[PDB]
Structure 1
Amino acid sequence: IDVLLGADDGSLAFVPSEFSISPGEKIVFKNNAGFPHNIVFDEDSIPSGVDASKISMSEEDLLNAKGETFEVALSNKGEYSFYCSPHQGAGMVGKVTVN
């Protein structure tokens, strides 16, 4: 599943921001507009026992250039909330459900 980092109109959003997937399916987060961006899973809002570091950028890490990507596949079922660190308050957040 491809997820744009920044919408095509410049909005500071993941597109899509809420979506499902099945275990092992690639998520490719791609810098689109308004970069730098990053993808951080919220360590308090992911499934029991999941290591957020295995699936996240750190908050200090950035994707700098247009078209740069961060790929992650999730395994464990349940809800995972994530955000872009520098743009979280602007509303650049999302939630993926592994089902």
Structure 2
Amino acid sequence: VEVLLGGGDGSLAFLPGDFSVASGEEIVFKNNAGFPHNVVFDEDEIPSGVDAAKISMSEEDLLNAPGETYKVTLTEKGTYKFYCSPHQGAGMVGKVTVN
């Protein structure tokens, strides 16, 4: 799945905003509109068997042109809220889940 950061430009959101995956699969986070963006897993709601610092981007690393991307192979069976830290309060939140 390629999670599209910038839902049609007219929705400051992902597409999808909720999805599920299997363990060992890869999520591709890519830009669409409204730049810049990033992906950050929420350190209070991720599963216990990981650290968001291995799956979020670095605090000053962001996707600033249209075609830029970030990628992660993900594991551990649980809920996965990742959001985009500039826009998470503005509503840009996604829910992956390894199931």
Q: Same-fold call, TM > 0.5? A: yes
**1:33 & 1:51 partners in 2: Cα distance?**
29
Give me the CA root mean square deviation: 1.1
Q: Return 5+ residue gaps in structure 1 as ranges.
A: none
Q: 1:57 to 1:72 in 2, by over 3 A?
A: same
Comparing both structures, which one devotes a greater share of its residues to strand? 1
1:2-81 equivalences under 5 Å are 2-81=2-81
**1:97 & 1:60 partners in 2: Cα distance?**
26
- 2:97: which partner in 1? 97
TM-score by length of 1: 0.93
TM-score by length of 2: 0.93
**1:2 & 1:63 partners in 2: Cα distance?**
14
Secondary structure of the 2:19 match is: strand
**2:43 & 2:61 partners in 1: Cα distance?**
16
Q: Provide the identity percentage.
A: 78
Whether the 8 Å CA contact 1:38–1:59 is kept in 2: the answer is no
**2:29 & 2:72 partners in 1: Cα distance?**
8
The alpha carbon displacement at 1:76 in A equals 0.6
**1:60 & 1:9 partners in 2: Cα distance?**
23
Paired positions, count:
99
